[PDB]
Symmetry: D2
Subunit: 295 residues, 4 copies
Amino acid sequence: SAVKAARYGKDNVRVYKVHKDEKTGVQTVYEMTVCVLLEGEIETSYTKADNSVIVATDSIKNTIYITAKQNPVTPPELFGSILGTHFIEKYNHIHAAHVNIVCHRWTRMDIDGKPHPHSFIRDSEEKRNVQVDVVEGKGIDIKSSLSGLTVLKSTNSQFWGFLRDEYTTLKETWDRILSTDVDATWQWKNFSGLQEVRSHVPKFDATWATAREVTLKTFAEDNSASVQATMYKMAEQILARQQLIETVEYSLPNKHYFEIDLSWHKGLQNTGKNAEVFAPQSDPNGLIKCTVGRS
Amino acid sequence: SAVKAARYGKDNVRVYKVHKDEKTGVQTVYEMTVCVLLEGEIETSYTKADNSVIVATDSIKNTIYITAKQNPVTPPELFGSILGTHFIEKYNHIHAAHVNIVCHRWTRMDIDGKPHPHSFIRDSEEKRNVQVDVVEGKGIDIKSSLSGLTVLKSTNSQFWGFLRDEYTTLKETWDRILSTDVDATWQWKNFSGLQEVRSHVPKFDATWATAREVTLKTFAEDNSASVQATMYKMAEQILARQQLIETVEYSLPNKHYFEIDLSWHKGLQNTGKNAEVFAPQSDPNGLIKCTVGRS
Amino acid sequence: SAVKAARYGKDNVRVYKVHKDEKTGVQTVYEMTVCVLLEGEIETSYTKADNSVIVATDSIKNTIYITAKQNPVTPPELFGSILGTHFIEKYNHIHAAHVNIVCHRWTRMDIDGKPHPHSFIRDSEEKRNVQVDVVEGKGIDIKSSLSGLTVLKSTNSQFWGFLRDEYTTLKETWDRILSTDVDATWQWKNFSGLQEVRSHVPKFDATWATAREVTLKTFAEDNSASVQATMYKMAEQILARQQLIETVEYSLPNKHYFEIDLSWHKGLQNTGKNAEVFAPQSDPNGLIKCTVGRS
Amino acid sequence: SAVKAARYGKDNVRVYKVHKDEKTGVQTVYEMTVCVLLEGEIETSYTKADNSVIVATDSIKNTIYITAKQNPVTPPELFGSILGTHFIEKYNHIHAAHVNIVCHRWTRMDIDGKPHPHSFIRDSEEKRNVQVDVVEGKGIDIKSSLSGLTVLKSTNSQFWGFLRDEYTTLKETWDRILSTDVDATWQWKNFSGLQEVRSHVPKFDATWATAREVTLKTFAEDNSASVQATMYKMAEQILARQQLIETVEYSLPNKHYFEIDLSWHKGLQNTGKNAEVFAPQSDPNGLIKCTVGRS
Ligand SMILES: O=c1[nH]c(=O)c2[nH]c(=O)[nH]c2[nH]1
Ligand SMILES: O=c1[nH]c(=O)c2[nH]c(=O)[nH]c2[nH]1
Ligand SMILES: O=c1[nH]c(=O)c2[nH]c(=O)[nH]c2[nH]1
Ligand SMILES: O=c1[nH]c(=O)c2[nH]c(=O)[nH]c2[nH]1
Ligand SMILES: [Cl-]
Ligand SMILES: [Cl-]
Ligand SMILES: [Cl-]
Ligand SMILES: [Cl-]
Ligand code: NA
Ligand code: NA
Ligand code: NA
Ligand code: NA
């Protein structure tokens, strides 16, 4: 036997950082969950009980905190890049660092119409994420995403004209509910290293904003032919707006809301045009994916 | 043996309702999870395999949908009261109905600065809940709450002057982070029945708003001596503002954010006044509760 | 305003303990999650920012670990009683301690047909729990339970003869699946204090065993008329077998498994006697409860 | 823009099947969660609102139930292969089917020392899974796994001799707790199609058994130098025992159990050789991975 692939490190590292403007009194908080997994000439830790080649996962954990202390933690693409670069540079025998960051929302509170200097609210479980692969000799590969963005529209969703055969029961509809949890990922052009990432720093927050904005507007305004057609419109607009991204991926569940026939009860009419009360279905769910690039 | 207590019914009933203004095109959605448990002369279903006294939980489920079809689902205190009243009136041998409702947020989207007529976003897992106990001969007992409201303040929290003995290691602090998940409950004066509930309908949304507002403002503005002292200030203000509530309950976890001593590494200073990077603790957590009434 | 009720302390305290037989080499592990909430003359911590009366929740946490170090952690009824007794005795102004313990399973592994001396497997998320209320002047009130015991029987469950009216759609059935998550609680006679608890120590593991055994056997062997009738048979047998318990409570979801009509497809027969493939329903679910005591 | 990748279908399809021996009265149950995602000439559903090429996810759902009705659902490698093969054969323009199956445990109950004919218990959340990729023209790629197998050993785990530098605080230890959630995957040799899968059917249950057995025995008996070294021993034995598998992957969290220094309290000794009470850590956790193949 032989080791074909190996990576190890520390997962679920919770991190908070605060910035305090002693001038204005305004504080700003950041909270994330970090995973760092290393690759390199480590196969003998597996095959020969050779721990000498292991940078302890506890030490990886310390390094995450120390790096947060000494560097910006925003945007997460930058923090991820600094952290991964540290491991491959610091340790000769480590040749890749895989950095995953989940950013948790802490939105400044408005109290009586004015932003509060140090109080925050978690306005949803929507996350901003990065996946940063720092590979010695091959630069920095970054995937950015938003996830957990849950939306619903009550009309202007349709689903008709699909294939019909002996396995098909679904009725065509020209007016349905559409609800999903948006998972959207934009893949950056390969960066040659930390310097190139630094040179593009303002583009990270901006592209996240754009992706978020395009998603919400297209969802709200598209009179949707299908989840497939709607998600494609989102991806093409994001690509059009950021030349440094190579692909946009969407993964969308179709979280079904079923009509409830109540005509068996006093002839109550609750279907089609009379549909008022629906049963949200927890499972099963459609799952629709696509990766869009440029022609 | 004998049955000392019994209740049965349907839990986790997911319900959606839409309202459509055909005049304006504006749609409004409501989504909830409902539980209805009945009590009454049902002990022989347990002791004698006498199913004749059972209103099927499947029928309870149907009844929830039918009631949503034929009545307002807002405010949830009213819907809960109508639903519970239905069971005790419809079935002679049913003498109490216990209605729990969790309301899920669907906040209208703003697209390019304007509210969209039929698109919504789940802006957090914060819930609005009710517990409605409809008891034949003894009216309607309503508990209203907000839960899952997650907040953090980065300063203006303190914890010193607590009891110190041989079990105490905790250092006194005059400046810490405070973060919690707010669970707040206001208990209404007993209502004599559905008519009395109806007579107070506008007070339900208003008192929820007040509770929410008082919570957020007191959290943001109190230079907190402890979770105990802060939560009491919230409760007393809510009581002061709604004479029809008898008590206000808070249940607050203290979600700890620990300083990280980094002085072992290149003498980095990250404690006290230099504290920038913290480790959020998933567990354990303080849990602080109180029920406040009027003197 | 005034404080009507108050309790505070530390929740989600994870605890492991190991016992090592240096003679035999056999080790035994225990793992739990503990919550301790105190009551007493603490209202001024809420109303007057008077922290002097607060035994820090961090100190409560320390005390849980120290108590585990110096006392048996099994049975959990005893450990809970020692822990609660400690707080009301140690602190004059603390008058009740509320101790909740969740015990996690670590079952010794058998390797090649022989029990291993120090390796364990989590054979399910079923828990053994206690709720121990230690109230100064009023002894120790103990509720013991098993929860998360998930079972299914594929036949010998029936549900017919229930009330039928205009809200009823459910078909009567003489052969269905029954599946539940068993939550069963036995309430002990009040104990006067820690000494009385000590005097009954062997009865705790034994009564848990009995409850577990009666549950599984009655579930497997009862040709069930309903969840109600089956659960009552469990409770009455447990009561018959332990005079020191006053009541037995069951809370059982009916986790529905629906037939799937496939006759629309090539006349496939998959209902009634031909029913082979079913759709397990995640929600809604029946929820059936009863508290049984002696006549 | 252009579609670079696309797949769509139905996720979280819960399925139960029962087998009844009318001769013996013995029933056997199977329960799973299924996801089927299709690929093919479907890009115009995304780019042109062309639903004609969509096999409805609702129809995919029906097909899963119908396939379960008409075929064995065990072993899951076979069921997955039949299901995926169906889509690529039935639909000319569908060229791959991705079938993920999670199998839930329903272990026959023993009642008074004898196996019960139709009653079952969920003896843990451990799963048996498959990932079956059916690709037209390129056969069937199968990955089998066990996951959620949670174990602990109380001694005979060590971790010393690892790299020490200015980021290292962790003390070397020659006796620690080791606990993990085992995720183990064996990758089968490519199969040319459904016939080849059929020809190996008995090897699926057998290799799952072997993997399970090797995991538990190696965990219990290895005096572990590290998670890395232990997991490698598991993988090499599995490979040695099934020539038709090409690689074995492990993904293991190191679920840390920390010593608790209690010497600050009455000089209590609870570290090193005196270590009895530990604090299980929910996060962070080590995460150790490797993919082992043959030399
Ligand atoms: O937008 C949809 N896409 C599908 O592929 C599909 N399939 C289905 O049943 N409903 C829908 N809806
Ligand atoms: O606000 C607090 N209340 C307490 O009761 C307590 N106890 C503790 O350890 N920290 C805190 N903080
Ligand atoms: O055992 C049952 N009890 C009920 O009360 C009930 N109600 C229902 O719809 N199914 C069942 N099954
Ligand atoms: O078995 C281990 N492997 C590691 O790589 C590691 N790192 C760490 O901190 N503890 C351990 N333990
Ligand atoms: Cl779908
Ligand atoms: Cl606290
Ligand atoms: Cl039921
Ligand atoms: Cl580790
Ligand atoms: Na390197
Ligand atoms: Na009645
Ligand atoms: Na006392
Ligand atoms: Na095909």
